[PDB]
Design a protein around this ligand. Structure first.
Ligand SMILES: N[C@@H](Cc1c[nH]c2ccccc12)C(=O)O
Ligand SMILES: N[C@@H](Cc1c[nH]c2ccccc12)C(=O)O
Lengths: 373, 373
RNA sequence: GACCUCGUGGCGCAAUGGUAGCGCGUCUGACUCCAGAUCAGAAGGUUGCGUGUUCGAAUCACGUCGGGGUCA
RNA sequence: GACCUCGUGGCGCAAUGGUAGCGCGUCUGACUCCAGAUCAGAAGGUUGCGUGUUCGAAUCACGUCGGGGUCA
């Protein structure tokens, strides 16, 4: 697959080691999430500082986001949200979720209306993940921008402190780009500063922020961590995750356009099964005889990587890794297992989502004081 | 002085001729303002289209702005506002005034708080000009941005349609600039689109806008007029004004830093006099004998250019132009005259300004439906 | 305002008498426990528009829309 | 994260034994009805900070703050 240890060293982040994991445990009195245990969330930035504060009764809040590329979301999209929902429960902190409808409107051929609608439609599945209506604010850039005292003020502060060359260097823009993309990064940085949410943090400017996100989002926050000092704020802490594997392989890329690219949150019990069997890449030997002697390759097998994300029972996963690695299990049974797991899983989601009424999305997306004052 | 006819041809605007002036008269049933008569507002863009609509009962609104560089404003600053106040009265249309506190915060070493305060302090003199509290909305970018449904949405629409090279070309920015300056132009364009003021134009998107402004502001609107079609809107009409002359000469530049650079709205009866006599550049001959034979040079004489802006009585101005041009009047009397005019003028302002209470600035700057629904 | 330029078969790109190439691509059959490789086949709304000039125009002239590039 | 670089007398810029230049600049006197030109003079909080190494440091080493430039 891909070498994440090099990414870490490359970018400058830090590896999450057992020490850290154990701290999280001692600090939360709850067994750390399997993403932490199984290396899905492998890198971090300043997580110890976060823990130190937390353990010393100093408040911190969660910040994560979603780009509403489309109405169709897929299993891969849920990882950061799933983990964030867990972090919220376990630490009992408020959460802020950014729907970058304005970003997609900029990067894709979408109309302001479409973008927004996707931001709202997506809010449903994000909500379906179980976030506490009392301590989480899901917001649309297009909306919130125009109904906030602090948000825009921080963008302007952040923009006055980031040159085109910087973003050119970081994001690789070009003189040919729209001034809208050139300064969009400021918008994604802004929610890293508590006072961007006056109605929930009280013009407070030193509240620690922890940003769980996929490893590829880091550049935005590297730029953010960079400006913060320069503007009198504290830099956001980070917990990075690995990329979710496409059905065709860890290497290949997945889009909301290729439906056979991944399992979508709307797929049916039957579609789930079909996708795995007819598209999930394998690490299993060609002939079944070959497999029995050599055993599968757990490292490149998409189906197994999947279980790694959704088979919660730590022991059962092992039984599979073992019997699969040795050859005792044919990729056929493996896949069969992944389905037996995914089906009830997506079904579950689809139900929780249906319970999300319009008035619930409304509340979630309404800026207001949150439980933990 | 400077050749404005070349500016016109250069930029692509149009000269305001008697034909146009007479139309304005026929259309308003009021004698056109002396700025129009005396060539202070000399260039325009689509003014006839505006008139056509107006004469055919189609609504149009006024849009002009102010950069709150500082708390100290000077006579030169008032020209566009004076003329705008006249246009409002005469056509009876609503007006929108932009205080670019966010622009100064970006271009000058100011803090968000300072900028805003200047935006508010300046609002006072702008209000002191007589605008109708019922049909004019003075607003701060920093404020309004965060309390508007449409404004930000138009910036994003405008930004998705203006490349860095464009602004680089138009404004001459550089890769070295902050992403904040690079896309600031979108912000100044946005108020050219009625639906940026939903609470006053009702999500209406085709209301004609007329932007009175100093000739050097045009580039922003050339860029604006350019995007508009591309985003489904109508391009703003323009009425350009000449530059107000610095006390040292039409050529030299004036800043709120050099106090002897111009007559400031706070100066005293005595300071007024001092500034003219001790700094107002002259077109008068060296020796008084020389003057008597050659006569002054009305073209470069700052003091006379001043009367051109504030001596309202068309005939009296002539008496001066004549007796001065021939030599019958020494620049000494000329200057003496300019003072006798300016003193009561500034005094007046200072009083009107004092009547502007905090609750009045508040109302003006509060987004709300305006008289002409 | 003006001028320059580009405007493809789902995306990325090629100038008429022989099979318009695939970079990527999908769907069919075969072989494997699957998936991939491989082998054998099929299909895909074709020229941004509108007038033209020519025997013939994707390859030309005018107008037009959109992307990108340009001027104290 | 790291490294490169810059960090002036109101602004823009210059490497010790002779008057640290003015580009712009202000305020004084003179000459003109004024203003400007011109002529004659004066002044302006001086090295981003903090330690140092040296006889001597604006010109060097470490740390630091800020601007700008940099890396699959
Ligand atoms: N830019 C991310 C969404 C996002 C915005 N803010 C964030 C903060 C943390 C993680 C993700 C985000 C995307 O396109 O999906
Ligand atoms: N940018 C102008 C102010 C301004 C903003 N919007 C405007 C519209 C018309 C005229 C002036 C303005 C300035 O700096 O003074």
């Amino acid at each position: 697959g891909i070498d994440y240890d090099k990414l870490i060293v490359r970018f400058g982040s830090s590896k999450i080691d057992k020490e850290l994991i154990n701290r999280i445990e001692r600090a939360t009195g709850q067994r750390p999430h399997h993403f932490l245990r199984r290396g899905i969330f492998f890198s971090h930035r300043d997580m110890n500082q976060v823990l130190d504060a937390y353990e010393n009764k100093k408040p911190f809040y969660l910040y994560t986001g979603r780009g509403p590329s489309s109405e169709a979301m897929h299993v891969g999209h849920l990882i950061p949200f799933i983990f964030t929902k867990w972090l919220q429960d376990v630490f009992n902190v408020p959460l802020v979720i950014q729907m970058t409808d304005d970003e997609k409107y900029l990067w894709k051929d979408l109309t302001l209306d479409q973008a927004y609608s996707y931001a709202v439609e997506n809010a449903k599945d994000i909500i379906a993940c179980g976030f506490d209506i009392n301590k989480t604010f899901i917001f649309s850039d297009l909306d919130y921008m125009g109904m906030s005292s602090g948000f825009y003020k921080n963008v302007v502060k952040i923009q006055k402190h980031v040159t085109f060359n910087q973003v050119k260097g970081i994001f690789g823009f070009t003189d040919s780009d729209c001034i809208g993309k050139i300064s969009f990064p400021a918008i994604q940085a802004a929610p890293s500063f508590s006072n961007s949410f006056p109605q929930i943090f009280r013009d407070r400017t030193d509240i620690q922020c922890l940003i769980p996100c996929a490893i590829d989002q880091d550049p935005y926050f590297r730029m953010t961590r960079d400006v913060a000092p320069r503007i009198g704020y504290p830099k956001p802490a980070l917990l990075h995750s690995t990329f979710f594997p496409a059905l065709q392989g860890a290497q290949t890329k997945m889009s909301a356009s290729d439906p056979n690219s991944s399992i979508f949150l709307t797929d049916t019990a039957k579609q789930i099964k079909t996708k795995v069997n007819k598209h999930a890449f394998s690490g299993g030997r060609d002939t079944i005889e070959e497999h029995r002697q050599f055993g599968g390759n757990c490292d490149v097998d998409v189906s197994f990587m999947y279980l790694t994300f959704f088979l919660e029972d730590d022991d059962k996963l092992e039984q599979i890794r073992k019997d699969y690695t040795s050859g005792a299990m044919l990729t056929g049974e493996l896949k069969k297992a992944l389905i037996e797991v995914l089906q009830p899983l997506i079904a579950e989601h689809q139900a929780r989502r249906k319970e999300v009424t319009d008035e619930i999305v409304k509340e979630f997306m309404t800026p207001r004081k949150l439980s933990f004052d």
